[PDB]
Design a protein around this ligand. Structure first.
Ligand SMILES: CCCCCCCC/C=C\CCCCCCCC(=O)OC[C@H](COP(=O)(O)OCC[N+](C)(C)C)OC(=O)CCCCCCC/C=C\CCCCCCCC
Ligand SMILES: CCCCCCCC/C=C\CCCCCCCC(=O)OC[C@H](COP(=O)(O)OCC[N+](C)(C)C)OC(=O)CCCCCCC/C=C\CCCCCCCC
Ligand SMILES: CCCCCCCC/C=C\CCCCCCCC(=O)OC[C@H](COP(=O)(O)OCC[N+](C)(C)C)OC(=O)CCCCCCC/C=C\CCCCCCCC
Ligand SMILES: CCCCCCCC/C=C\CCCCCCCC(=O)OC[C@H](COP(=O)(O)OCC[N+](C)(C)C)OC(=O)CCCCCCC/C=C\CCCCCCCC
Ligand SMILES: CCCCCCCC/C=C\CCCCCCCC(=O)O[C@H](COC(=O)CCCCCCC/C=C/CCCCCCCC)COP(=O)(O)OCC[N+](C)(C)C
Ligand SMILES: CC(C)CCC[C@@H](C)[C@H]1CC[C@H]2[C@@H]3CC=C4C[C@@H](O)CC[C@]4(C)[C@H]3CC[C@]12C
Ligand SMILES: CNCc1ccc(OCc2ccccc2OCc2ccc(Cl)cc2)cc1
Ligand SMILES: *[C@@H]1O[C@H](CO)[C@@H](O)[C@H](O)[C@H]1NC(C)=O
Ligand SMILES: *[C@@H]1O[C@H](CO)[C@@H](O)[C@H](O)[C@H]1NC(C)=O
Ligand SMILES: *[C@@H]1O[C@H](CO)[C@@H](O)[C@H](O)[C@H]1NC(C)=O
Ligand SMILES: [Mg+2]
Lengths: 268, 983
C-alpha cells in the first residue's frame, strides 16, 4: 500500500489537497472557538462572579494543616521538641502574612458592622480592606511564646473561614468559632478552649468580601483556639464549628463546609 | 459396478440367493459386522458451545481485549498506589456486559429460528419387505443388510440401495436425490455404467411410485448415495459471511487508529515530564477509549430488525449475519427441480385444430388461459376426462386443485387436475358416461382404451375413447378432427402431426395422443357384450382429437423473481441434475435464457454448419452437461463461465454443483445457492448464503441452508436482496453516527492529561452516552428509505466497497467529532468562567484542583473553595459536556439520515421512529440532569438553561455544513469534492 508513486492509496498531489482542506477546516473551527472564548470573557464581570452555585456556605480550614489518611491528624510529643518544631514553623509562616508590614495596604476598622462599599475610593480604583494583624491573636500570635503553646501541651489552632464574594454571615451578632470534642471522653470533662480574639468572633467589618480585583490587600480574619484540657497519650477528635445565621455545617458530602474536624493526640 | 455385474456374478459376492435371499443367522452376522441400515446422526454442537460461539467475533474480540487492558491498567495503577481506579472496572464491566447480552440476544434468535424450522420436520419409523431363506415378512428397514432380498411396491419407500432383479411397471421418484422431475422406470437391466443413470438401481429414501420390484441390497446406511452425499456435505467448511468480513476490516481500522493515537500521546506524555508507567497507563486508556461500547448492540439490533422484516414475509434466517448476504450477492446458482419448478407434472401445451395452445400452469391459476370454444376442444376434453382412472382423495373439496392429492400416476393426476380446472367436476362428468369396457395400459400395446355410454338418454351410441403414445395413436386413427370436421390424414395432417410432436418434445415435454370413435347403434346396440379377450370392438379407424403435452412447470413468482434479480445485476445460473432438454426449456421459460439468446448448437442448427465451426463468443447461452463437466479442468470451466453469460448446468451431481459454486467463489463473487433436495446440500453449505424451500426442501437441504423460505415463495429472494442492500446502507449510516461521538468523549481526557485542566468528562457520563442516550437514535437509522433505485444498482464490489472506509472514518472522527469537541469545550469554559474559574487559571489547575489536602483553593475572584465544592463544579463540567454532545448528536442523527440526498428531499419527519428516538434522548437527558439525587448517584448536575443553548449553534453548524457537503456532491458528480468529501 505504501507504494512510491501512490503513497497509502493516494497520490502526492492529492495528499497535499486533502491536507490543505483539513488544515483550513481546523483553522476555521479554531477561530470560531477563540471567538467564542473572547465573547465569553467580554461578557464576564471582573469584580463579581456570575453565579455562586457551589459556594452557598464557606469552607473552614485549620492551621497548622497536617493530613493523615482520612483527614487532618496532628500528633506530637511534649517532651520532644522536634515533634512540634514543624508545627510551630508552619504557624509562623502562616502568620508572616499578618505582620504590620504585610498589612500596610489595609486600614484601621472599628465599626463592628458590615463594611459596605459601593464606590471605589481606595488607591488605584479599589476598595478599602480592613487590617488584621497577628498581635490580635495575643497568646497565640507567636509572642511572647514562639511555640504557640505546643511546648506546654496547650496548642493554638488558627481557624480561617473561606472568603466568598458578597457573602454575608449574619449581622445580628458576629460569627463565632466554637470548638468541642466530637465524642465526649467518658471520665473526662468537655473541651476547655480560650479564644483570640475574645469569644472567638470575626468582626463584621471584614465582610463583605468584594474579590481580589476590588480588595487586593484583603486578609481573612483569624480566630485562634487555644486548647487547655487535652488529655495526654489519648486519641481525641475535635470539631470547630462556625456559629452564624447564614453558615451551615450539616453537609454530608463536604466535611469542611461550615466546620473543621481534626484528629489530635498529645503524647508525653 | 453391482449393476454392471450379473446375477451369476452376484449371489456370490453377497453370499445370498436371488430367490430366497439371505439366511437369518448370516443376516444377523452381517448386521453385527456393519451397522444398522440407517444414516449416521449428526453429532451437532451443545447449546453452551453455540453460546460461546455467539460470544465470539471480531468486535467481540476487540471488546474482550479492551476489557483485559482495562484490568491490566487497574492492576498497574493499584500497584502504583493510585486510587479512583473505579473507572477501569466500570469500563471493563460495561464492555463485558454488552458482549454477553448481545451474545444472549443472538443465541435466542438462533434458538427461535431453529424451533420455527424444526416445527415442520416429523419422524415416523420405516419398514421394509424382506425375504429370508424363503420366508417373506415385514421387517424394520434398519435391520436390512447388504445382500438382503427385498420387495417394494407402489407407495413404499425404497429401504436401501438396491439392484433391481424383478420389476413390473416400477417407477420411482428421484427428484430429491437426483434432479429428475419425471418418474423413472426401474427394470432388471443395465442401461448405463454409472449407478446414478442405470435403470436397475433403486435409491435409498426414494419412493416407489407404482408397480412392484424385487432386488438385492447392495449398499446400506452411509454407504448409500444419500449417505455419501451426507458425508460430502459434512466435509464442506462454512466460510465467514461478508458482513463478518466487513466488521473485521472495520475492527482493524479502529485498532490501527487506536494504536497510532496511543503511541503519539505516549510520546507526548513522556516529553512533558510524565513517568514511563503513567505514560503507559495513558496509552492503554487511549486504546480502550477508541473501542466503542454500544456499537455491537446497535449492529445486533439493526440485523434483528431486518430479520424480523424478512420473517414477516415467511423468510426465516438461522443467523443474524445472513440478512445481509443477498444484498451483496452477485451470482445465484439455482437448482431447477423443486426450486424453480413446482416438482409436479402439469398440462402445459395442447395441439388441436392445427394450433399449439398454452395452458395455465401456475399453481394459483394466475396466468393466461386458452381458447375453449371449439367443438374439437369439447371432444378433446371429453376424451381426456373419460380416459382417466385417477381419483381425488375424499374430503378434499376446499383444497386447491393443483395442490390436491389424487390416487394415480403422474400423467393421470395431471390430466385429472386439468379436467377439474377446465371442464370442472371431472368425476361428476365421468359418472355421466358409464364404462362398459376398458383395456388398461400395457407396454405391448402402449395405449389405454375404454368404451362408455353417452349421457344423453336419446343417444344409444357407444363412445370409444383412446389415449397413448402419439405414434401408437397415429398408426391407428385414419381421421382427424379439425374445427368439427372429420377429415382423413392426407399426409398433410401426418406431416403437421410430426412437426407438432417434434416441437413439443423439443420443448422438454412429454406428449400424449387422444382420439375417439363413436360406435354405431346398428352394429353395437345397447347391451352389446364387448370382449377384451376377442377384440370384437374396433380398435382402428379412429378420429384423432389432439395432442396434450406435460412438463414440471415453474412456480408462479419464479420468472418475475429471476427477471428482477437479473435487473439488479445478479447473474443467475441453473445447476440441475435433470436432463439438458428440460433444463434448457425451463431456463428459457423462467428468464435464465433470454429471448434471442442462442447456444453454439442453436447457431450451428441455424447456419447448417458443424458445431465446432461456430465461434463460442457469438453464443450468449450455454448448456453444459455433467459428462462434459467431468472432462473439464478449472481453466476450461472459468473460460466457459466468462464466455457465456447465460449458463445452464444440466445432469449435474452434488459434487459438481459444489465445484461450480467453488469456481464462482474463486472468481471473486459472493454466491447464493437456492435448492430443496439432498443433491443441493453440499452446494448450500459451500455458498455464501444458502436458501432452501420450506415445504419442498429436504432435511439435509434445510440443515445446510442459512435461509428458509417457509412458503416456498421464490420472490422472497428479491425481498432478501433489497433488504440486504438497504441494511448495508443503513448500517453504514448508523456506524457513522455511533463513531462520531467517540472523539468528543476522548478529547477532554487528552486535554486533561496534556494541559492539566480539571477533568471535563467523567467515565460514568461517557458510559451513559454510549449505552443509554444514543443507542435508540443509532438504531432508528435502520428505518431509513433508500435514496435511489436500490434494485437497479449493480452488486457492490466486495474488495472496493467496504462497509466502513477511509472517507467515512475520517469525516465522522475528525470533522463532525471535532466540531462536537469544540462545542463541548466551549460549554466547559463558559460554565467554569461563570462560576469563577477563568480559562487561563483552568490551564494547569488539575493537581491543586484534585488535591484533597487543599480546602481553600482560590478562584479567579479570590474566593476559596473546598475540595467538595470543586468536585461539584467538576460534576457540573461533566454535565455541560454531556449536554453539548447530546445536542450535537441530535444534528448528527439528522444529517446521517442521507449520504447524498438533502434532509429536505428525504423528509425531516418521515422516520417517526427517528423522531421518537430524538424525543426520548432529550427526555433522558433532562431526567439525568434534574432528578433529585443525581449529583451523588451518577454525578449529573442540574445545569442552567444557557448551558443548553451554547452548543446549539454548533449543532446548527453541523447540519448546515453537512447539507452543503451533500449539495456539493449532488451538483458536481465526479469532481474532487465528490471523490474526497463523499462517503
Ligand atoms: C487539532 C486542532 C486542535 C486545535 C485546538 C484549539 C487550538 C486553540 C485553542 C486554544 C489556544 C488559545 C486560543 C483561544 C484563546 C482565547 C480567545 C481569547 O481571546 O480569550 C481571551 C482570554 C484572555 O482574556 P482575559 O482573561 O484577560 O479577560 C478577562 C476580562 N475580565 C477581566 C473583564 C473578566 O485568553 C484566554 O482565555 C487564553 C486561554 C484560552 C485557551 C484555554 C485552554 C484551551 C485548552 C484546551 C482546549 C482544547 C479544545 C480542543 C477541541 C477540539 C479538539 C479536536
Ligand atoms: C447491555 C449492557 C449495558 C449495560 C450494563 C452495564 C452497565 C454498566 C457496567 C458497570 C455496572 C456498574 O456498576 O456501573 C456503575 C455506574 C455508576 O456507579 P455508582 O456511582 O452508583 O457507584 C457507587 C460507588 N462509588 C460511590 C464508590 C462510586 O453506573 C453506570 O455507569 C451506568 C451507565 C449507563 C448504563 C445504561 C444502560 C442502559 C441499558
Ligand atoms: C425519559 C424517562 C425519564 C425517567 C427514566 C427513569 C425512570 C425513573 C423514575 C423514577 C425513579 C426516580 C427515583 C424515585 C422517584 C423519587 C424521586 C426523588 O425525589 O428521589 C430523591 C432521592 C433522594 O434524593 P435527595 O433528596 O438526596 O436529592 C436532593 C436533590 N439534590 C442533590 C439534587 C439537589 O433519590 C433516591 O433515593 C435515588 C434516586 C434514584 C434515581 C434513579 C436510579 C437509577 C435509575 C435509572 C438510571 C437509568 C436512567 C436512564
Ligand atoms: C466549517 C469548515 C469550513 C472550512 C472550509 C475549508 C474548505 C474551503 C472550500 C474548499 C473548496 C474545494 C473546491 O472548490 O473543490 C473544487 C473541485 C474541483 O473539481 P474538478 O474541477 O476536478 O471537477 C471536475 C469534474 N469532472 C471530473 C466530472 C469533470 O471540486 C468542485 O469543483 C466541486 C465544487 C464545489 C462543491 C462543494 C462546495 C465546496 C465548499 C466547501 C465549503 C464548506 C464549508 C462552508 C461553510 C459552511 C458553514 C457555514
Ligand atoms: C424535544 C421535546 C423536549 C421537551 C422538554 C423536555 C422536558 C423538560 C421539562 C422539564 C425539565 C426541566 C425543568 C424541571 C427541573 C427543574 C430543576 C431546577 O430548577 O434546577 C435548576 C434549573 O436551572 C435552570 O436555570 C432552569 C433550567 C430549566 C430547563 C432548561 C433545560 C431544558 C431544555 C430543554 C430543551 C429541549 C429541546 C431542545 C433540544 C432538542 C432540539 C430539537 C438548577 O438550579 P440553578 O440553575 O438555580 O443553579 C443550581 C444551583 N445549585 C447548584 C445550588 C443547585
Ligand atoms: C490555502 C488555504 C486557503 C487553505 C487551503 C484551501 C484548500 C481547501 C483549497 C485551496 C486550493 C484548492 C485545490 C486547488 C487544486 C485542486 C486540484 C484539482 O484537480 C481539484 C481541486 C483541488 C483539489 C482544490 C481543492 C481545495 C483546495 C485544496
Ligand atoms: C467509546 N470509548 C469511550 C471512552 C471515551 C473516552 C475515554 O477517556 C478515558 C477516560 C475518560 C474519563 C475518565 C477516565 C478515563 O480513562 C481511565 C482509564 C480507562 C481505561 C484504562 Cl485501560 C486506563 C484508564 C474513555 C472511554
Ligand atoms: C490600626 O489600629 C491599631 C490599634 O489601634 C493601631 O496600633 C495601628 O497604628 C492602626 N493602623 C495603622 C495606622 O498603622
Ligand atoms: C495569656 O497571657 C497573659 C500574659 O500576657 C496571661 O496573663 C494569661 O493568663 C494568658 N492566658 C492564656 C492561658 O493563654
Ligand atoms: C514520646 O512520648 C512517649 C510516650 O508516648 C515517651 O515515652 C517518650 O519518652 C517521648 N519522647 C521523648 C523524646 O521523651
Ligand atoms: Mg431440486
Amino acid at each position: 500500500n505504501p507504494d512510491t508513486g501512490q503513497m497509502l492509496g493516494r497520490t502526492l498531489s492529492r495528499w497535499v489537497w486533502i491536507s490543505l482542506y483539513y488544515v483550513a477546516f481546523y483553522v476555521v473551527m479554531s477561530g470560531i472557538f477563540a471567538l467564542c472564548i473572547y465573547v465569553l470573557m467580554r461578557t464576564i464581570d471582573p469584580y463579581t462572579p456570575d453565579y455562586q452555585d457551589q459556594l452557598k456556605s464557606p469552607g473552614v480550614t485549620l492551621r497548622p494543616d497536617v493530613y493523615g489518611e482520612k483527614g487532618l491528624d496532628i500528633s506530637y510529643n511534649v517532651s520532644d521538641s522536634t515533634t512540634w518544631a514543624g508545627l510551630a514553623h508552619t504557624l509562623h509562616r502562616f502568620l508572616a502574612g499578618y505582620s504590620p508590614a504585610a498589612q500596610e495596604g489595609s486600614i484601621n476598622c472599628t465599626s463592628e458592622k458590615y463594611f459596605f462599599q459601593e464606590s471605589f475610593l481606595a488607591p488605584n480604583h479599589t476598595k478599602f480592606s480592613c487590617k488584621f494583624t497577628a498581635d490580635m491573636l495575643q497568646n497565640c500570635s507567636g509572642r511572647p511564646d514562639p511555640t504557640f503553646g505546643f511546648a506546654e501541651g496547650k496548642p493554638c489552632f488558627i481557624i480561617k473561614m473561606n472568603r466568598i464574594v458578597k457573602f454575608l454571615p449574619g449581622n445580628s451578632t458576629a460569627p463565632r468559632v466554637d470548638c468541642a470534642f466530637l465524642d465526649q471522653p467518658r471520665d473526662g470533662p468537655p473541651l476547655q478552649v480560650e479564644y483570640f480574639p475574645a469569644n472567638g468572633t470575626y468582626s463584621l467589618h471584614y465582610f463583605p468580601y468584594y474579590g481580589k480585583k476590588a480588595q487586593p490587600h484583603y486578609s481573612n480574619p483569624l480566630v485562634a483556639a487555644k486548647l487547655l484540657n487535652v488529655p495526654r497519650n489519648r486519641d481525641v477528635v475535635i470539631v470547630c464549628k462556625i456559629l452564624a445565621e447564614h453558615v451551615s455545617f450539616d453537609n454530608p458530602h463536604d466535611p469542611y463546609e461550615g466546620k473543621v474536624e481534626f484528629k489530635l493526640k498529645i503524647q508525653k | 459396478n453391482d449393476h454392471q455385474l450379473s446375477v451369476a456374478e452376484l449371489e456370490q459376492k453377497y453370499q445370498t440367493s436371488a430367490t430366497k435371499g439371505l439366511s437369518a443367522s448370516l443376516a444377523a452376522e452381517l448386521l453385527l459386522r456393519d451397522g444398522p441400515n440407517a444414516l449416521r446422526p449428526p453429532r451437532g454442537t451443545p447449546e453452551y458451545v453455540k453460546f460461546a460461539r455467539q460470544l465470539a467475533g471480531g468486535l467481540q474480540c476487540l471488546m474482550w481485549v479492551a476489557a483485559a487492558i482495562c484490568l491490566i491498567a487497574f492492576a498497574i495503577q493499584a500497584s502504583e498506589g493510585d486510587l479512583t481506579t473505579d473507572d477501569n472496572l466500570y469500563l471493563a464491566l460495561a464492555l463485558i456486559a454488552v458482549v454477553v447480552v448481545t451474545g444472549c440476544f443472538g443465541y435466542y434468535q438462533e434458538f427461535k429460528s431453529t424451533n420455527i424450522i424444526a416445527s415442520f420436520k416429523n419422524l415416523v419409523p420405516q419398514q421394509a419387505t424382506v425375504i429370508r431363506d424363503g420366508d417373506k415378512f415385514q421387517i424394520n428397514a434398519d435391520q436390512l443388510v447388504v445382500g438382503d432380498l427385498v420387495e417394494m411396491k407402489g407407495g413404499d419407500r425404497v429401504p436401501a440401495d438396491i439392484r433391481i432383479l424383478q420389476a413390473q411397471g416400477c417407477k420411482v421418484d428421484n427428484s430429491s436425490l437426483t434432479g429428475e422431475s419425471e418418474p423413472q422406470t426401474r427394470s432388471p437391466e443395465c442401461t448405463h455404467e454409472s449407478p446414478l443413470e442405470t435403470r436397475n438401481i433403486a435409491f435409498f429414501s426414494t419412493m416407489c411410485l407404482e408397480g412392484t420390484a424385487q432386488g438385492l441390497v447392495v449398499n446400506t446406511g452411509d454407504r448409500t448415495i444419500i449417505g455419501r452425499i451426507a458425508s460430502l456435505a459434512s466435509g464442506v467448511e462454512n466460510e465467514k459471511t461478508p458482513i463478518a468480513i466487513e466488521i473485521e476490516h472495520f475492527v482493524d481500522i479502529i485498532a490501527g487508529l487506536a494504536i497510532l493515537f496511543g503511541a503519539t500521546f505516549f510520546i507526548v506524555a513522556m516529553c512533558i515530564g510524565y513517568t514511563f508507567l503513567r505514560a503507559m497507563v495513558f496509552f492503554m486508556a487511549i486504546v480502550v477509549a477508541y473501542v466503542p461500547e454500544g456499537l455491537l448492540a446497535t449492529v445486533t439490533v439493526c440485523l434483528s430488525l431486518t430479520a424480523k422484516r424478512l420473517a414477516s414475509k415467511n423468510c426465516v434466517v438461522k443467523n443474524l449475519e445472513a440478512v445481509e448476504t443477498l444484498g451483496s450477492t452477485s451470482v445465484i446458482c439455482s437448482d431447477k427441480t423443486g426450486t424453480l419448478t413446482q416438482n409436479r407434472m402439469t398440462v402445459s401445451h395442447l395441439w388441436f385444430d392445427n394450433h399449439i395452445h398454452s395452458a395455465d400452469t401456475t399453481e394459483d391459476q394466475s396466468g393466461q388461459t386458452f381458447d375453449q370454444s371449439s367443438e374439437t376442444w369439447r371432444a378433446l376434453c371429453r376424451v381426456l376426462t373419460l380416459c382417466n382412472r385417477a381419483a381425488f382423495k375424499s374430503g378434499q373439496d376446499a383444497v386447491p386443485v393443483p395442490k390436491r392429492i389424487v390416487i394415480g400416476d403422474a400423467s393421470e393426476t395431471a390430466l385429472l387436475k386439468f379436467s377439474e380446472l377446465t371442464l370442472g367436476n371431472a368425476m361428476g362428468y365421468r359418472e355421466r358416461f358409464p364404462k362398459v369396457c376398458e383395456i388398461p395400459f400395457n407396454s405391448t400395446n402402449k395405449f389405454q382404451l375404454s368404451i362408455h355410454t353417452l349421457e344423453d338418454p336419446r343417444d344409444p351410441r357407444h363412445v370409444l375413447v383412446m389415449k397413448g403414445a402419439p405414434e401408437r395413436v397415429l398408426e391407428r386413427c385414419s381421421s382427424i378432427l379439425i374445427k368439427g370436421q372429420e377429415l382423413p390424414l392426407d399426409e398433410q395432417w401426418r406431416e403437421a402431426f410430426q412437426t407438432a410432436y417434434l416441437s413439443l418434445g423439443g420443448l422438454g415435454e412429454r406428449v400424449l395422443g387422444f382420439c375417439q370413435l363413436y360406435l354405431s347403434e346398428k352394429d353395437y346396440p345397447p347391451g352389446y357384450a364387448f370382449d377384451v379377450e376377442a377384440m370384437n370392438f374396433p380398435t382402428s379407424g379412429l378420429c384423432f382429437a389432439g395432442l396434450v403435452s406435460m412438463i414440471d412447470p415453474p412456480r408462479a413468482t419464479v420468472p418475475d423473481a429471476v427477471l428482477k434479480c437479473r435487473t439488479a445485476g445478479i447473474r443467475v445460473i441453473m445447476v440441475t441434475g435433470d436432463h439438458p432438454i428440460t433444463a434448457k426449456a425451463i431456463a428459457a421459460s423462467v428468464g435464465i435464457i433470454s429471448e434471442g439468446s442462442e447456444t453454439v448448437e442453436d447457431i450451428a442448427a441455424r447456419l447448417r454448419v458443424p458445431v465446432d465451426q461456430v465461434n463460442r463468443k457469438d453464443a450468449r447461452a450455454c448448456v453444459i452437461n455433467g459428462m462434459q463437466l467431468k472432462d473439464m479442468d478449472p481453466s476450461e470451466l472459468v473460460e466457459a463461465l466468462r464466455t457465456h453469460p447465460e449458463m445452464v448446468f444440466a445432469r449435474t451431481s452434488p459434487q459438481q454443483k459444489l465445484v461450480i459454486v467453488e469456481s464462482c467463489q474463486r472468481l471473486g463473487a459472493i454466491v447464493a445457492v437456492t435448492g430443496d433436495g439432498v443433491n443441493d446440500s453440499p452446494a448450500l453449505k459451500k455458498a455464501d448464503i444458502g436458501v432452501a424451500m420450506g415445504i419442498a426442501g429436504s432435511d439435509a437441504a434445510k440443515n445446510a441452508a442459512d435461509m428458509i423460505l417457509l412458503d416456498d415463495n421464490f420472490a422472497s429472494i428479491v425481498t432478501g436482496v433489497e433488504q440486504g442492500r438497504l441494511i448495508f446502507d443503513n448500517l453504514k449510516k448508523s456506524i457513522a453516527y455511533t463513531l462520531t461521538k467517540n472523539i468528543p468523549e476522548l478529547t477532554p481526557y487528552l486535554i486533561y492529561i496534556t494541559v492539566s485542566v480539571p477533568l471535563p468528562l467523567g467515565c460514568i457520563t461517557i458510559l451513559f452516552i454510549e449505552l443509554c442516550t444514543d443507542i435508540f437514535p443509532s438504531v432508528s437509522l435502520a428505518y431509513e428509505k433508500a435514496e435511489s433505485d436500490i434494485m437497479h444498482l449493480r452488486p457492490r464490489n466486495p474488495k472496493r466497497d467496504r462497509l466502513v472506509n477511509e472517507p467515512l472514518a475520517a469525516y465522522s472522527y475528525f470533522q463532525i467529532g471535532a466540531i462536537q469537541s469544540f462545542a463541548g469545550f466551549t460549554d466547559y469554559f463558559t460554565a467554569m468562567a461563570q462560576e469563577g474559574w477563568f480559562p487561563l487559571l483552568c490551564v494547569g489547575l488539575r493537581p491543586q484542583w484534585e488535591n484533597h489536602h487543599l480546602q481553600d483553593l482560590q478562584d479567579s475572584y479570590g474566593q476559596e473553595w473546598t475540595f467538595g465544592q470543586r468536585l461539584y463544579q467538576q460534576y457540573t463540567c461533566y454535565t455541560v459536556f454531556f449536554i453539548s454532545i447530546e445536542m450535537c448528536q441530535i444534528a448528527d442523527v439528522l444529517i446521517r439520515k442521507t449520504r447524498r440526498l438533502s434532509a429536505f428531499q428525504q423528509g425531516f419527519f418521515r422516520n417517526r421512529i427517528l423522531v421518537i428516538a430524538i424525543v426520548f434522548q432529550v427526555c433522558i437527558g433532562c431526567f439525568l440532569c434534574y432528578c433529585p439525587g443525581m449529583p451523588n448517584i451518577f454525578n449529573f448536575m442540574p445545569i442552567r438553561f444557557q448551558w443548553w443553548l451554547v452548543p446549539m449553534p454548533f449543532s446548527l453548524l453541523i447540519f448546515v455544513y453537512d447539507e452543503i457537503r451533500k449539495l456539493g456532491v449532488r451538483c458536481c458528480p465526479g469532481s474532487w469534492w465528490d471523490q474526497e468529501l463523499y462517503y
